[PDB]
């Protein structure tokens, strides 16, 4: 029952998305997950499953870089979690993101 990660932000760097968060407890690992935004209302009712960012399943820093072709042009949700190896943290706040940008 670890504390949840905080200050979740997305940015763009070259052909990559960069997801940054802040965590105060040292010696932690993180897992980054994503979801289609429309899944919270159309199926809703927990009739969906969160997915993992391809190479951010077990990151060691408070940062995650991943290619932009991980996503299509749409609206996605991102969330982060932490573990000590045994105990897992509550899930971060879900952030919404538009991959098109206009």
């Amino acid at each position, epitope marked *: 029952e670890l504390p949840p990660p905080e200050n979740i932000e997305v940015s763009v760097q070259n052909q990559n998305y960069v997801l940054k968060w802040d965590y105060t407890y040292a010696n932690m690992t993180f897992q980054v997950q994503w979801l*289609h935004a429309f899944l919270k209302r159309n199926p809703g009712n927990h009739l969906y499953k969160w*997915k993992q960012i391809p190479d951010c399943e077990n990151v060691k820093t408070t940062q995650c870089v991943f290619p932009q072709n991980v996503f299509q042009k749409g609206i996605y949700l991102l969330r982060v979690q932490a573990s000590d190896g045994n105990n897992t943290s509550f899930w971060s706040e879900e952030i919404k993101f538009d991959t098109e940008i206009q």
Partner: antibody
Amino acid sequence: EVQLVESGGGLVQPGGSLRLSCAASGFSLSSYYMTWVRQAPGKGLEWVSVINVYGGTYYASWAKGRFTISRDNSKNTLYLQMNSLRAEDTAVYYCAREDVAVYMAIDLWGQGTLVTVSS
Amino acid sequence: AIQMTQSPSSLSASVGDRVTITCQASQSISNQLSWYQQKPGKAPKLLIYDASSLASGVPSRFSGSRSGTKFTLTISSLQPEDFATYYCLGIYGDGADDGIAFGGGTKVEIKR
């Protein structure tokens, strides 16, 4: 009771155009990722293209130049437009529904239509 | 762009054997690998999703496992009705351009 029924396909001359269609029966077509997958004679499955719920199109590299996926929401129908067809395009073409909610896999196929590109 | 390397291309085995198909991704795709069975003259049938989750109506002899970018489909007791071609399907991220790839397939014939 949901089903995908493709039509079109048949004998088409090299360089010609063709439009495959796929009628979805029993479900709301525009709320799934819909894909075309092809199988050349005696070969494996080959992913051709996908259209998502917002209407964005994504392709395999070799298919992007000559193939166009689309859908008519007023007809509940998916389409694959094929221009400048090659003999190497001769294949069975399958309509296929991708479930992104849970599976992240293909959960429903059409029966396939044969496309023969020959003179 | 992602590629799935499936192995073996074909195999023969007796009724009751334990057979294993392997499929390696060119890069990590998390668990987003599914396994399909194609009988002669029919469309493919979904067997396994998320690397290890059996689809509805699939006998318990089919199982799936992951280890990095190497995925394994296993048939524990091969049956005569299992003659088929098996494909893996890897979807990188949300399957954008060249983000979806089938493996080459594996023909499975029963040795009698």
